[PDB]
């Protein structure tokens, strides 16, 4: 199913929503270690967007 | 189980991803009948998101 | 006119009000096919939001 999707649809369904949410938070907070911050953001919020 | 999730997680895992794309397309194209357009977008792209 | 509005105003003045209600109903009812339900909700209620 997922593996058959075109790139755009695959990404839009799996990571684009949590990423946009994370980028918005990053842009507002501007923390010292932005790449680390974004990785942590993804892990801290992944449960919202998928059921593990 | 989806049925017992909190509201935000429930919506995030069902309609948010296709809605984000639909709203982006709507904003770009600005068609004459936006509500109709958006509902059509959902139905036309549903197979890619469920 | 609508076509010249910035993105947020354009969406706020076209689909946000009916979406807010549709998402609320979706969250409460948690139907089996949420994307279909949401699109149907838009088409069924659009007369009251146009």
């Amino acid at each position: 199913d997922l593996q058959s999707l075109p790139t755009r649809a695959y990404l839009d369904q799996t990571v684009v929503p949590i990423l946009l949410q994370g980028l918005a938070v990053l842009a507002k907070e501007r923390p010292p270690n932005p790449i680390e911050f974004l990785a942590s953001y993804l892990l801290k919020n992944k449960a919202q967007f998928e059921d593990r | 189980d989806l049925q017992s999730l909190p509201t935000r997680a429930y919506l995030d895992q069902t309609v948010v991803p296709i809605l984000l794309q639909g709203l982006a397309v709507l904003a770009k194209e600005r068609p004459p009948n936006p509500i109709e357009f958006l509902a059509s977008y959902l139905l036309k792209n549903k197979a890619q998101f469920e | 006119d609508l076509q010249s509005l910035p993105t947020r105003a354009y969406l706020d003045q076209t689909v946000v009000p009916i979406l807010l209600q549709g998402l609320a109903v979706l969250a409460k009812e948690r139907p089996p096919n949420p994307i279909e339900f949401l699109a149907s909700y838009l088409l069924k209620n659009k007369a009251q939001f146009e």
């Binding site: 929503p17 | 709203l23 | 947020r8 969406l11 706020d12 979406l19 998402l23």
Partner: peptide, 21 residues
């Protein structure tokens, strides 16, 4: 995408607003 950031904003508002009903 950029209006995706604004569609992002919008959906998030909505949901958070439903958090309080």
């Amino acid at each position: 995408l950029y209006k995706e950031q604004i569609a992002e904003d919008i959906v998030w508002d909505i949901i958070d607003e439903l958090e309080q009903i």
